[PDB]
């Protein structure tokens, strides 16, 4: 199926405490694979997945140099935006960007994107057409106007169609044993008493890759989406993910509720129940 290359980038000012913190974190499908952090003792691009050992020293030097240039760009941007919004020098502000591309199973571009926020709100984004921008506000309208006159969108589109997809293909090739694997969830149900002759049933799904999963609880073949509590799917420290979902049910009637787990590594979905 399809894959994505995504960089999450953040620049955060800290007046009185020196230069902004600047970070780039790169993912191929839900797996962290590279990082730059300006606060590191010796800031350089670093591999975050084992298969990135396949890149030569030239990769790390060039991406380090690009990160450092990017860092200086965002430093400038933070001062620029202070003026656009008429804000004082004394406050901390944050710029965020998500940038990258998605390809189909045949390696071809499906979607490119580049979206910026300031202080946690939409700022500007490249439209799906890869030719125009949407600006959330009048500050971002200034940026839009600059990028239009400089041909920034065509520059970005050449990156997205070219470099972004070509490198994503290479990462998928080099990292294939990791990136194209499936790790099947293992599930279980826990039980906790409540006041009022009621009971929490919690369905866990552990050790799975990729992150996409569905957990439901059923009674009489109907899903109880309304009454479930859940946590967002979450990383577990070793490149796998976990999730839980719970339902509150009457004491003595636990045996009528069934958790269902759907996932790529489950040829047939799991059905389980509390087992005393």
């Amino acid at each position: 199926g399809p894959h994505s290359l995504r960089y999450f980038v953040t620049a955060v000012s800290r007046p009185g405490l020196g230069e902004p913190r600047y970070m780039e974190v790169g993912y191929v499908d839900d797996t962290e694979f590279v990082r730059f952090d300006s606060d590191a003792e010796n800031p350089r691009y670093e591999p975050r997945a084992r298969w990135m050992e396949q890149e030569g020293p030239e990769y790390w030097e060039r991406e380090t140099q690009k990160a450092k240039g990017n860092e200086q760009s965002f430093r400038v941007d933070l001062r620029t935006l202070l003026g656009y919004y008429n804000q004082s020098k004394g406050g901390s502000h944050t710029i965020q960007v998500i940038s990258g591309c998605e390809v189909g199973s045949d390696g071809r571009l499906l979607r490119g994107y580049q979206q910026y926020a300031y202080d946690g709100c939409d700022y500007i984004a490249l439209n799906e057409d890869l030719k125009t921008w949407t600006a959330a506000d009048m500050a971002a309208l200034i940026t839009k106007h600059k990028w239009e006159q400089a041909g920034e969108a065509e520059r970005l589109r050449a990156y997205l169609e070219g470099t972004c997809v070509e490198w994503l293909r290479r990462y998928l090739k080099n990292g294939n044993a990791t990136l194209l694997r499936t790790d099947s969830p293992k599930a279980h149900v826990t039980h906790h008493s409540r006041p009022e002759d009621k009971v929490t049933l919690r369905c866990w799904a552990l050790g799975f890759y990729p992150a996409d999963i569905t957990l439901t609880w059923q009674l009489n073949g109907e899903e109880l989406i309304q009454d479930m509590e859940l946590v967002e799917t979450r990383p577990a420290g070793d490149g796998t993910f976990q999730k839980w979902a719970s339902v509150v049910v009457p004491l003595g009637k636990e045996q009528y509720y069934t958790c269902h787990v759907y996932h790529q590594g489950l040829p047939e979905p799991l059905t389980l129940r509390w087992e005393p």
Partner: peptide, 8 residues
């Protein structure tokens, strides 16, 4: 793999 970003 990452873009060289433009200033805003």
């Amino acid at each position: 793999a990452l873009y060289n970003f433009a200033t805003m």
